[PDB]
Design a protein around this ligand. Structure first.
Ligand SMILES: [Mg+2]
Ligand SMILES: [Mg+2]
Ligand SMILES: [Mg+2]
Ligand SMILES: [Mg+2]
Ligand SMILES: [Mg+2]
Ligand SMILES: [Mg+2]
Ligand SMILES: [Mg+2]
Ligand SMILES: [Mg+2]
Ligand SMILES: [Mg+2]
Ligand SMILES: [Mg+2]
Ligand SMILES: [Mg+2]
Ligand SMILES: [Mg+2]
Ligand SMILES: [Mg+2]
Ligand SMILES: [Mg+2]
Ligand SMILES: [Mg+2]
Ligand SMILES: [Mg+2]
Ligand SMILES: [Mg+2]
Ligand SMILES: [Mg+2]
Ligand SMILES: [Mg+2]
Ligand SMILES: [Mg+2]
Ligand SMILES: [Mg+2]
Ligand SMILES: [Mg+2]
Ligand SMILES: [Mg+2]
Ligand SMILES: [Mg+2]
Ligand SMILES: [Mg+2]
Ligand SMILES: [Mg+2]
Ligand SMILES: [Mg+2]
Ligand SMILES: [Mg+2]
Ligand SMILES: [Mg+2]
Ligand SMILES: [Mg+2]
Ligand SMILES: [Mg+2]
Ligand SMILES: [Mg+2]
Ligand SMILES: [Mg+2]
Ligand SMILES: [Mg+2]
Ligand SMILES: [Mg+2]
Ligand SMILES: [Mg+2]
Ligand SMILES: [Mg+2]
Ligand SMILES: [Mg+2]
Ligand SMILES: [Mg+2]
Ligand SMILES: [Mg+2]
Ligand SMILES: [Mg+2]
Ligand SMILES: [Mg+2]
Ligand SMILES: [Mg+2]
Ligand SMILES: [Mg+2]
Ligand SMILES: [Mg+2]
Ligand SMILES: [Mg+2]
Ligand SMILES: [Mg+2]
Ligand SMILES: [Mg+2]
Ligand SMILES: [Mg+2]
Ligand SMILES: [Mg+2]
Ligand SMILES: [Mg+2]
Ligand SMILES: [Mg+2]
Ligand SMILES: [Mg+2]
Ligand SMILES: [Mg+2]
Ligand SMILES: [Mg+2]
Ligand SMILES: [Mg+2]
Ligand SMILES: [Mg+2]
Ligand SMILES: [Mg+2]
Ligand SMILES: [Mg+2]
Ligand SMILES: [Mg+2]
Ligand SMILES: [Mg+2]
Ligand SMILES: [Mg+2]
Ligand SMILES: [Mg+2]
Ligand SMILES: [Mg+2]
Ligand SMILES: [Mg+2]
Ligand SMILES: [Mg+2]
Ligand SMILES: [Mg+2]
Ligand SMILES: [Mg+2]
Ligand SMILES: [Mg+2]
Ligand SMILES: [Mg+2]
Ligand SMILES: [Mg+2]
Ligand SMILES: [Mg+2]
Ligand SMILES: [Mg+2]
Ligand SMILES: [Mg+2]
Ligand SMILES: [Mg+2]
Ligand SMILES: [Mg+2]
Ligand SMILES: [Mg+2]
Ligand SMILES: [Mg+2]
Ligand SMILES: [Mg+2]
Ligand SMILES: [Mg+2]
Ligand SMILES: [Mg+2]
Ligand SMILES: [Mg+2]
Ligand SMILES: [Mg+2]
Ligand SMILES: [Zn+2]
Lengths: 59, 83, 208, 99, 99, 138
RNA sequence: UGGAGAGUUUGAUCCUGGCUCAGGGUGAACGCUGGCGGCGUGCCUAAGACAUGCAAGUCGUGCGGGCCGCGGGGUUUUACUCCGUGGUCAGCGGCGGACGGGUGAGUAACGCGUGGGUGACCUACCCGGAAGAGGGGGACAACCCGGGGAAACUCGGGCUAAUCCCCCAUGUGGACCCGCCCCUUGGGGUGUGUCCAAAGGGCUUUGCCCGCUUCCGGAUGGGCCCGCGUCCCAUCAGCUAGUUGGUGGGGUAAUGGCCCACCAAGGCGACGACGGGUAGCCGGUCUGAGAGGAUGGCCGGCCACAGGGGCACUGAGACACGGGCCCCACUCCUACGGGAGGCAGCAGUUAGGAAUCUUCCGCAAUGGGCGCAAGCCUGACGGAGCGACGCCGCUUGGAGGAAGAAGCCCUUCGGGGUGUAAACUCCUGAACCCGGGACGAAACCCCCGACGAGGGGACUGACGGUACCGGGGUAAUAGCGCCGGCCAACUCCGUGCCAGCAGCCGCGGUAAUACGGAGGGCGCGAGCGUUACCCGGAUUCACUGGGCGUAAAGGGCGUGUAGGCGGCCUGGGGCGUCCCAUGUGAA
């Protein structure tokens, strides 16, 4: 589960992406943030597209 | 029977036919017997219609039936004209 | 679209002096006179020895930023020259200089390349009598790039066409100031264009 | 809900019925002739063979048998009839065998 | 034209039929080395005049049976039992490749 | 904020179904197409002021029950159902207890959840048990 | 006209060697963002199941009727009922439903590709040629009545028409047996014997037009056969009874064990039979320096399939996608005794999936079926629609403009950066508004002429009031990835092996260019990234182009089968090889 903080529970629907995490054993995939039940990362600003967060408007 | 008809080519909003002899059963643009000439219904070129009266005639003598507009075009290239 | 943004900022990055502004770029201030260094919080800090890649990259950018062209049209133009018979080096430039917008500028009608683009683009230019508004139009030997009616009386045009009085057009061309007409005579060549670019390097960039 | 390819099926059956009845005849008489031919009965053998030949060719004119098929049967029939007969035969009132 | 091949007879155990073994060489599509391969054809011998050991010309023909699509064209030479010994050995050998 | 496709409009008659070519203001009918639109959503011409009409409402459920399939194999069959169901009735809701992993199905009344489950069996081919939700102690 | 490499085993080194990355590509999907246009292109998964409409039909110039229209006749806006015309509905008859379109299931196979063979063959309609179209009978629908029934529609009797069916005749000719001649796998000729042809329909009436019969020939389209080529596993090694061959039959258009009798025992296999796995094949496409590798969506060719399986009928052609029969699976209707169905056609539904559309317009064009023709039909096709899915093109402005506003960020507090960027001044004028408005359409047809040639005349546009043109005219969108090394681009703050990053090496332990933010920068731009897969880098299966003493790798040693390879000289042949010509190598 990429990004700082998530909203995933024992029943959330996720979109798997492929790509392993070097320091984690049976971990061969990454959950795609911003799809189905995985909210984008909150307050993210930089690499936005990789963390399913929409461009923030200057309000 | 065998025929002499227009096979479409060119492109969308750019009709460019090919006067060809094919069995009446091939699809409109499928394999054909022989190409005898070409035709461009929009005269984008002075040379917008060529025919090989020689061959055209040959095929006519052997049964090949010209479709109407195929007939129109051949007539115009002077195939039926016996002078 | 094209670049549409700070131009002079590029002249400092390429170290050289680009002419993406016309008139100003002659006055005492193409920024190459004031801040001849790279833009940014840095710029005037020690410059590390350029990597083999950084050399070709910067040289290739140098040439492309000179014509306004996108990296897509640039590379496409390039691959075509490669295919072409002859020293891709020269040929490339040749195709770049054949571009319609360019020719208009190389003709005078426009103070700079961007302006030429807008001229061509706004139907002000005319090739062989018929109007063309496609900057990428390839001009061929023998064509006549000129102006148009509603276009002639125009303010900016007279200005730009008056500055041409006396001024001579590159060997490969032949302006006709009082007629606002002009012919594309010959395809240019490596020597005809005094470009601050080593094309041999651009060739090498496109290998990897 | 229905197309009229049904007429075609109707055609189908009747025609089927038709030439079905013709093929029986052909097989029967043919068999009948060769049976007699082996039995030494030259005259009636040949007599029946002629009838068969007619019925075969008559089948050929339409969509029942057709062409070489009819051509073929006749040959097999004649080939068979003649051979069996020269078992002390001599062709009486030479039917349909030029000889 | 009708394909014509030359091989030696290696089998006359059949009636009016002989087994002709034809060889052929060719450049390896990848490693270019010329290699020799071989194929066995059942050739029609109606007069039963060809026997085991003959090198003969085989010619493409109207099917005589399933498998027999060639007819013996003519004798090239006779007695090449040497050429048969090989094939037979090559075959005999198989009895030593199982389990 | 979604582009929808109104493939065809249709009037519900006392016996058959008439397929009309259009429906003007002040008239009611049913449209075929639209895969996203739900109850309460506003539909405006593909250009017209992208306004958002009033209406909808939706009272909050009054009773909750925990539901679990008959076999772990029917899990997604059930979940997929509940979801589909919460889509037609904004008054019915599916939630997952944060602490105790069970799935809490909720509606407007005993009778309500009754036709739901029963609807799950007959119309969705999923058989599930229902019971009082577990309690998160301390 | 064509070849780039880097990081990572060590204290350091050279080699070996694997992992990893930079590139190109896609029917794509996912994330962010999103202005236009053109041309392409869009169920890759459930060959799952499908509501609904539409995808072949067409002929009264083949034939008899039914119901209606209009008119004139006994008499009526009481024509009903009674000639005669234009329609209509089925039926009979014909031609087409074997083309077109869909799909990739099955198939490693003469399936396909390539080149050949047929003395072993077929070909409706179309051309060319020859000769005919003379008599005589008959039935079944339609229809009326009767019976079964709720219905589908069924059953009985009874007439009845033809280009429907049948007999006879003429036999240019043709078929068959036989004898002969030629020729050579069953081809060409010839003689006696036997055997086989037919429709009349419409007009400006013997003169034309469309049809009918036989034969010869042409074209076109096919069947069957053959050489060579066509994936992985040998931890699949033996396979085989219609099996291999013969004789005689059956069968078909034709060869063949194809099918069947009888005889003989053969046939195949390490040059990989048999078995299992996977797969439609090709033109091509992607990648690559090339040689290779991978691939076969779109388009063109063959093939195969049409809910699964089997089978014939009709026919020039089918064992037939919208024909038929039976079995299986499944679904629908019902007055519960039997009725109905088959989207891998267009479009659409539902299911599955990460995912791919209008139940649109039109027959104006091109092509197809029928008709003498008018014309009818054609979800082939021509177009339009939605989707950055792809590529190409265009825009968000141009020229001036400060040692240089503010804000924000650094700051050795002097100042430096954003940056000519903005403001600001002019100029041009995407959009939009107004006027006009296509090409694609000349022929079928009609007129003089012979229905010929030739000349002449008229009708016809879905796309569209669109493209384009003239006129007037507003400045009027910008995003996304990256900034430790490969690798192009740095600072401050927050944080403190926490939170996180991560393709590899590895960053994070309180000055982190490696995390999160900010300023700044580099790369691209109507986009940018990500994931998955393919080729490249991988000389990393080394044919081009690697290796085995110690890095992986010489079999424990002989003997020897197949196989591979083989000295000097001269002749023959000329298979390999080389050369030229020619065919083929579709588009
Ligand atoms: Mg990865
Ligand atoms: Mg990052
Ligand atoms: Mg009919
Ligand atoms: Mg009997
Ligand atoms: Mg035989
Ligand atoms: Mg290391
Ligand atoms: Mg290495
Ligand atoms: Mg070590
Ligand atoms: Mg170390
Ligand atoms: Mg489309
Ligand atoms: Mg599919
Ligand atoms: Mg239709
Ligand atoms: Mg229709
Ligand atoms: Mg059909
Ligand atoms: Mg087809
Ligand atoms: Mg397949
Ligand atoms: Mg398959
Ligand atoms: Mg197999
Ligand atoms: Mg072959
Ligand atoms: Mg072939
Ligand atoms: Mg027919
Ligand atoms: Mg004729
Ligand atoms: Mg009646
Ligand atoms: Mg009766
Ligand atoms: Mg007839
Ligand atoms: Mg006669
Ligand atoms: Mg005669
Ligand atoms: Mg005679
Ligand atoms: Mg007769
Ligand atoms: Mg008669
Ligand atoms: Mg083979
Ligand atoms: Mg036989
Ligand atoms: Mg035979
Ligand atoms: Mg068999
Ligand atoms: Mg196998
Ligand atoms: Mg298998
Ligand atoms: Mg390579
Ligand atoms: Mg290939
Ligand atoms: Mg497809
Ligand atoms: Mg294809
Ligand atoms: Mg099947
Ligand atoms: Mg299906
Ligand atoms: Mg079936
Ligand atoms: Mg089937
Ligand atoms: Mg038949
Ligand atoms: Mg059919
Ligand atoms: Mg069938
Ligand atoms: Mg079939
Ligand atoms: Mg269908
Ligand atoms: Mg469909
Ligand atoms: Mg789904
Ligand atoms: Mg579409
Ligand atoms: Mg329509
Ligand atoms: Mg049409
Ligand atoms: Mg037509
Ligand atoms: Mg289309
Ligand atoms: Mg400016
Ligand atoms: Mg103005
Ligand atoms: Mg027009
Ligand atoms: Mg015209
Ligand atoms: Mg006349
Ligand atoms: Mg005329
Ligand atoms: Mg004329
Ligand atoms: Mg018409
Ligand atoms: Mg660097
Ligand atoms: Mg980084
Ligand atoms: Mg673009
Ligand atoms: Mg390699
Ligand atoms: Mg080697
Ligand atoms: Mg090595
Ligand atoms: Mg060791
Ligand atoms: Mg070792
Ligand atoms: Mg040793
Ligand atoms: Mg050992
Ligand atoms: Mg040896
Ligand atoms: Mg030697
Ligand atoms: Mg040797
Ligand atoms: Mg020699
Ligand atoms: Mg030779
Ligand atoms: Mg050649
Ligand atoms: Mg050659
Ligand atoms: Mg050649
Ligand atoms: Mg070609
Ligand atoms: Zn400048």
């Amino acid at each position: 589960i990429p990004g700082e903080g998530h909203n995933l529970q024992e029943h959330s629907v996720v979109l798997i992406r492929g790509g392993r995490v070097k320091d984690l054993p049976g971990v061969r995939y990454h959950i795609v943030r911003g799809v189905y039940d995985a909210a984008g990362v909150k307050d993210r600003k930089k690499s936005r597209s990789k963390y399913g967060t929409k461009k923030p408007k200057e309000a | 029977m065998v025929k002499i008809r227009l096979a479409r080519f060119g492109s969308k909003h750019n009709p460019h036919y090919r006067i060809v002899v094919t069995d009446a059963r091939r699809k409109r643009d499928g394999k054909y017997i022989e190409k005898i000439g070409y035709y461009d219904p929009r005269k984008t070129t002075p040379d917008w219609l060529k025919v090989d009266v020689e061959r055209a005639r040959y095929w006519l003598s052997v049964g090949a039936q010209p479709t109407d507009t195929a007939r129109r075009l051949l007539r115009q290239a002077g195939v039926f004209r016996q002078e | 679209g094209r670049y549409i943004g700070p131009v002079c900022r590029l002249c400092r990055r390429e170290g050289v002096k680009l002419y993406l502004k016309g008139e100003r770029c002659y006055s005492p201030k193409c920024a190459m006179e004031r801040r001849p260094y790279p833009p940014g919080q840095h710029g005037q800090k020690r410059a590390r020895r350029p990597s083999d890649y950084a050399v070709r990259l910067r040289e290739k950018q140098k040439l492309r930023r000179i014509y306004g062209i996108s990296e897509r049209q640039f590379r496409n133009l390039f691959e075509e020259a490669s295919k072409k018979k002859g020293v891709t080096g020269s040929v490339f430039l040749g195709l770049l200089e054949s571009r319609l917008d360019n020719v208009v500028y190389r003709l005078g009608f426009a103070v700079s390349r961007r302006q030429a683009r807008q001229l061509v683009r706004h139907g002000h230019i005319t090739v062989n009598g018929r109007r063309v508004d496609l900057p990428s139009y390839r001009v061929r030997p023998g064509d006549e790039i000129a102006v148009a009616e509603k276009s002639r009386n125009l303010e900016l045009i007279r200005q730009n066409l008056e500055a041409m009085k006396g001024r001579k057009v590159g060997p490969w061309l032949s302006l006709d100031v009082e007629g606002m007409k002009g012919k594309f005579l010959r395809l240019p060549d490596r020597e005809d264009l005094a470009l601050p670019v080593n094309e041999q390097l651009v060739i090498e960039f496109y290998s990897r | 809900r229905n197309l009229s390819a049904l007429k075609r099926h109707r055609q189908s059956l009747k025609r089927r019925l038709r030439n079905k009845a013709k093929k029986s005849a052909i097989k029967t008489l043919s068999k009948k002739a060769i049976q007699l031919a082996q039995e030494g009965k030259a005259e009636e053998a040949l007599k029946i063979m002629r009838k068969a030949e007619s019925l075969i060719d008559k089948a050929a004119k339409g969509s029942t048998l057709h062409k070489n098929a009819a051509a073929r049967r006749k040959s097999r029939l004649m080939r068979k009839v003649r051979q069996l007969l020269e078992a002390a035969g001599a062709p009486l009132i030479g039917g349909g065998l030029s000889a | 034209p009708k394909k014509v091949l030359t091989g030696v007879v290696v089998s006359d155990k059949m009636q009016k039929t002989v087994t002709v073994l034809v060889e052929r060489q060719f450049p390896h599509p990848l490693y270019g080395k010329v290699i020799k391969r071989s194929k066995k054809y059942l050739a029609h011998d109606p007069e039963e005049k060809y026997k085991l050991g003959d090198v003969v010309e085989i010619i493409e023909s109207r099917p005589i049976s399933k498998r027999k699509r060639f007819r013996v064209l003519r004798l090239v030479e006779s007695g090449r039992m040497d050429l048969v010994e090989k094939y037979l050995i090559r075959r005999q050998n198989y009895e030593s490749l199982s389990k | 904020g979604r582009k929808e496709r109104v493939a065809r409009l249709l009037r519900m008659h006392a016996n058959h179904r008439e397929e009309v070519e259009e429906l003007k203001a002040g008239d009611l009918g049913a449209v075929v197409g639209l895969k996203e639109t739900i109850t309460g959503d506003t539909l405006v011409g593909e250009d017209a002021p992208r306004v958002i009409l009033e209406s909808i409402e939706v009272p909050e459920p009054v009773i909750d029950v925990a539901i679990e399939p008959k076999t772990k194999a029917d899990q997604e069959k059930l979940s997929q159902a509940l979801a589909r169901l919460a889509e037609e009735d904004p008054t019915f809701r599916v939630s997952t207890h944060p602490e105790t992993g069970q799935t809490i199905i909720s509606g407007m009344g005993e009778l309500h959840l009754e036709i739901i489950v029963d609807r799950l069996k007959r119309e969705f081919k999923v058989d599930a048990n229902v019971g009082k939700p577990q309690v998160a102690y301390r």
